[PDB]
RNA sequence: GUAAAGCGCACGCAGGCGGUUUGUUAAGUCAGAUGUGAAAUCCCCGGGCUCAACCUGGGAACUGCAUCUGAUACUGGCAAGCUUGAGUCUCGUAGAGGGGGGUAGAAUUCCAGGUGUAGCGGUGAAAUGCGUAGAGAUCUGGAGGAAUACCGGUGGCGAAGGCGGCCCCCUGGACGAAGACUGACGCUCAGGUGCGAAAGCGUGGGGAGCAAACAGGAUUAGAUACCCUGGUAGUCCACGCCGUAAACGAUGUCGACUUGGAGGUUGUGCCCUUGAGGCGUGGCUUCCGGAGCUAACGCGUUAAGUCGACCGCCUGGGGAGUAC
């Protein structure tokens, strides 16, 4: 999946504080990680469809996370996108 | 409850979710009947039993099984009670009209041996027809005298006697039987959650009901 | 997923009844209580309790008359994705009267009879007969 | 499920549905009232032509729309939460899950040489065929492609198709455990997007074995077959296309309930485990079977039982999944 190091690292850079892995923001971040890192792996092989399934899931899951955030706090949503350069 | 402490549970681990409300535990990989509520059962049974048993209550003790067999006879034969311990004929209760016909044949067959009405035909025939009485006195013997369905019946185990019971409740005849784990209570209307075997266990309640029944005759 | 908690409660009872189960349990909620109450006031269930503090439970005891169960039939009516509202002069008559129809009125969750008399209509919930 | 009928399978926008608590609102909803809903029909009661048909007085009804005044249980909106739904983190567990690259051994075939000599191969027999130009058998050396005995299973993993030697790298999912965190972020999904056995198609490779086509031999009345001797496509590879199958459990997905028995597989708490073991407790999975369901066969806690949310589909046979 993801490296424990980078995992914990990104946990604070967005976590509401410390060791609070679960925040709508935290998740999105942890998601975009593998989401972007996988592309590098997918750029190659390409025919690894079965692994794509996972990639796509996290992709859609992320959208469902952001969509929610924006609904529960337009603030964090607009700010979160920036630190990740998401939303086009 | 006294002598009741001589049978406890029975059957390894096959039971039946229907006997649950009567099971105590299962020490040593074996279900143990809840005798703590078994004796109380005896009341409703032994009560209603002697009740109708008063007016020459036609009681039918059933115990086709081996163990109880040799015993079941004495019990019912200790008063105006009848018994059946040899392969319950198919319909000897419901199809009585037809079954009784065999009884009559048996009756007259006895008279044959009774007086000089036996010494007839070649030894072959005599020896031939004699065999007939043998089995007949087994499958219909302990019931030869009972013109008409019994007022009730007390079957040993509700399992091995599935056929017998099936007819009883069909003729609207109250059923009294000892059920346990593997047994199916949905049949008998008077649940007697107790060991379905154990030479001692069977004789224990066998005569027990016999007495109350014979005693109920004033 | 639980898109209809009311249905669960109802089904829980009928399923239990036929199962001879002594009593039934489930997560309580304002509405569930009101229904369970009417079910008791009408003589369909022995009683009912609500255990738990932070997590509400609902000790609903079933009732069995003779060698049979009291609730011979209980089905949901005004279910989700298809609501049902009637008028004072519309309330259905369960089992020609021998039955009851729990209807939520602006005055509370009462039985069809009561509602019809109070002159107010509401939302049906089930037809316990 | 087998009668017509579950998209081959997933992700998911619109749409439909939405755990739990308090407050608030009052839109749906309920109540009251006010407009209006033409008269005639219809309906009830009552009249008038001798009766009836017919005519007529009154009421009812017009199941509807709008306004106003309330009621607030439920649904909807809003506010603040909550944690059991869903998800996140930590640590493990098993796995023929997927993509890429290596590599080993058994065998077949082919090439070369040795030994050796009249058969071999095949069938029901045969025959075609291969053999004295020396086969077959036997041994040595080499080339090459494809597939991985045993383990292996009532087995495992995957959404489905499907995935078996061993090794490395990249990668997806599932499960348990203690717990820690977010706080309804959920379920379903027309259209859409993507995945899709085999056969087939395009380009360029590869080609041992097997084999549509094709050619012989045999069989038969015939034999455009089955059988035998050969053998091209293809089967293999890379990339692209084709989207079908009895794509089947002929059974859509998610969730909650409802007696049992025996077994497989994988995780885990606890107990002199002295030894395996015993008390359990999650995930996945076989077989039998109760209630109930079923036209029956049968299904049966992995339901085809009892219920809820959403979806797809059926409406007599042939013509025809055909024509346009
Ligand atoms: Mg067919
Ligand atoms: Mg069909
Ligand atoms: Mg399918
Ligand atoms: Mg009018
Ligand atoms: Mg509300
Ligand atoms: Mg192919
Ligand atoms: Mg090709
Ligand atoms: Mg599986
Ligand atoms: Mg079965």
UniProtKB/Swiss-Prot annotation, chain A:
SUPFAM superfamilies registered for this protein in UniProt: S15/NS1 RNA-binding domain
Gene3D superfamilies (alphabetical): 6.10.250.3130, S15/NS1, RNA-binding
Protein origin, superkingdom: Bacteria
SMART domains: Ribosomal_S15
GO cellular component entries: cytoplasm; cytosol; cytosolic small ribosomal subunit
Induction: Part of the metY operon that extends to pnp, also has its own promoter.
Record's keyword terms, sorted: Ribonucleoprotein, Ribosomal protein, RNA-binding, rRNA-binding, Translation regulation
A GO molecular function held by the record: structural constituent of ribosome
Biological process terms in GO annotation: cytoplasmic translation; regulation of translation; ribosomal small subunit assembly; translation
Alphabetical list of HAMAP family matching this protein: Ribosomal_uS15_B (MF_01343_B)
Assembly notes: Part of the 30S ribosomal subunit. Forms a bridge to the 50S subunit in the 70S ribosome, contacting the 23S rRNA.
Family statement drawn from the similarity comment of this UniProt entry: Belongs to the universal ribosomal protein uS15 family.
Protein role: One of the primary rRNA binding proteins, it binds directly to 16S rRNA where it helps nucleate assembly of the platform of the 30S subunit by binding and bridging several RNA helices of the 16S rRNA. Binds to its own mRNA, stabilizing it 5-UTR and preventing its translation.
Record's protein name: Small ribosomal subunit protein uS15
Organism annotation: Escherichia coli (strain K12)
Lineage start: Bacteria, Pseudomonadati, Pseudomonadota, Gammaproteobacteria, Enterobacterales
Gene that this sequence comes from: rpsO
UniProtKB/Swiss-Prot annotation, chain B:
GO molecular-function term, one example from the UniProt record: zinc ion binding
InterPro entries the UniProt entry points to: Ribosomal_uS2, Ribosomal_uS2_bac/mit/plastid, Ribosomal_uS2_CS, Ribosomal_uS2_flav_dom_sf
Modified residues (N6-succinyllysine): 107
GO biological process, one term: ribosomal small subunit assembly
UniProt key word Ribonucleoprotein: yes
Gene Ontology cellular-component annotations: cytoplasm; cytosolic small ribosomal subunit
Keywords associated with the record: Ribonucleoprotein, Ribosomal protein
CDD domains on file: RPS2
Oligomer status and interactors: Part of the 30S ribosomal subunit, contacts bS1. Some nascent polypeptide chains are able to cross-link to this protein in situ. In collided ribosomes contacts ribosome rescue factor SmrB.
PANTHER family found in the cross-reference section: 30S RIBOSOMAL PROTEIN S2 PROKARYOTIC AND ORGANELLAR, SMALL RIBOSOMAL SUBUNIT PROTEIN US2M
Record family assignment: Belongs to the universal ribosomal protein uS2 family.
Functional summary from the UniProt entry: Required for ribosomal protein bS1 (rpsA) to bind to the 30S subunit.
Protein name: Small ribosomal subunit protein uS2
Gene giving rise to this polypeptide: rpsB
Curated annotation (Swiss-Prot), chain C:
Cellular component terms (Gene Ontology): cytoplasm; cytosol; cytosolic small ribosomal subunit
Keywords: Repressor, Ribonucleoprotein, Ribosomal protein, RNA-binding, rRNA-binding, Translation regulation
Record gene name: rpsH
Organism annotation: Escherichia coli (strain K12)
HAMAP family xrefs: Ribosomal_uS8_B (MF_01302_B)
Source superkingdom: Bacteria
Described purpose of this protein according to its UniProt entry: One of the primary rRNA binding proteins, it binds directly to 16S rRNA central domain where it helps coordinate assembly of the platform of the 30S subunit. Protein S8 is a translational repressor protein, it controls the translation of the spc operon by binding to its mRNA.
SUPFAM superfamilies linked to this entry: Ribosomal protein S8 (SSF56047)
InterPro entries per UniProt: Ribosomal_uS8 (IPR000630), Ribosomal_uS8_CS (IPR047863), Ribosomal_uS8_sf (IPR035987)
Protein name per the record: Small ribosomal subunit protein uS8
UniProt key word Repressor: yes
Keyword Disulfide bond annotated: no
GO molecular function, a single term: structural constituent of ribosome
Family: Belongs to the universal ribosomal protein uS8 family.
Quaternary data: Part of the 30S ribosomal subunit. Contacts proteins S5 and S12.
UniProt GO BP: cytoplasmic translation; regulation of mRNA stability; regulation of translation; ribosomal small subunit assembly
């Amino acid at each position: 999946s993801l490296s424990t190091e980078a995992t914990a690292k990104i946990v604070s850079e967005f976590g509401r504080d410390a060791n609070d892995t679960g925040s709508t923001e935290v998740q999105v971040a942890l998601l975009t990680a593998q989401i972007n890192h996988l592309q590098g792996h997918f750029a190659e092989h390409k025919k690894d469809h079965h692994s794509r399934r996972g990639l796509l899931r996290m992709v859609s899951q992320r959208r469902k996370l952001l969509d929610y955030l924006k609904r529960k706090d337009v603030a964090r949503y607009t700010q979160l996108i920036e630190r990740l350069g998401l939303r086009r | 409850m006294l002598k009741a402490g001589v049978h406890f549970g029975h059957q390894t681990r096959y039971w039946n979710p229907k006997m649950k409300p009567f099971i105590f535990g299962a020490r040593n990989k074996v279900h143990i009947i809840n005798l703590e509520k078994t004796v109380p059962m005896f009341n409703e049974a032994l009560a209603e039993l002697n009740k109708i048993a008063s007016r020459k209550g036609k009681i039918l003790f059933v115990g086709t099984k081996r163990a109880a067999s040799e015993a079941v006879k004495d019990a019912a034969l200790s008063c105006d009670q009848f018994f059946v311990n040899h392969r319950w004929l198919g319909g000897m209760l419901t199809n009585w009209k037809t079954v009784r016909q065999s009884i009559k044949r048996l009756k007259d067959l006895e008279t044959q041996s009774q007086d000089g009405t036996f010494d007839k035909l070649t030894k072959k025939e005599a020896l031939m027809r004699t065999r007939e009485l043998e089995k007949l006195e087994n499958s219909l013997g302990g019931i030869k005298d009972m013109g008409g369905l019994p007022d009730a019946l007390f079957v040993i185990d509700a399992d091995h006697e599935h056929i017998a019971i099936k007819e009883a409740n069909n003729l609207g005849i109250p059923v009294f039987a000892i059920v346990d784990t593997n047994s199916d209570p949905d049949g008998v209307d008077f649940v007697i959650p107790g060991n379905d075997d154990a030479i001692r266990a069977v004789t224990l309640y066998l005569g027990a009901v016999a007495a109350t029944v014979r005693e109920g005759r004033s | 997923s639980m898109q209809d908690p009311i249905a669960d409660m109802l089904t829980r009872i009928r399923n239990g009844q036929a199962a001879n189960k002594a009593a039934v349990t489930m997560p309580s909620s304002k509405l569930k209580v009101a229904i369970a109450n009417v079910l008791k006031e009408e003589g369909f269930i022995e009683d009912f309790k609500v255990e738990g503090d932070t997590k509400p439970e609902l000790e609903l005891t079933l009732k069995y008359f003779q060698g049979k169960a009291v609730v011979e039939s209980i089905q949901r009516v005004s279910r989700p994705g298809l609501r049902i509202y009637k008028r004072k002069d519309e309330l259905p008559k369960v089992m020609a009267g021998l039955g009851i129809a729990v209807v939520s009125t602006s005055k509370g969750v009462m039985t069809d009879r009561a509602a019809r008399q109070a002159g107010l209509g509401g939302e049906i919930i089930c037809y316990v007969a």
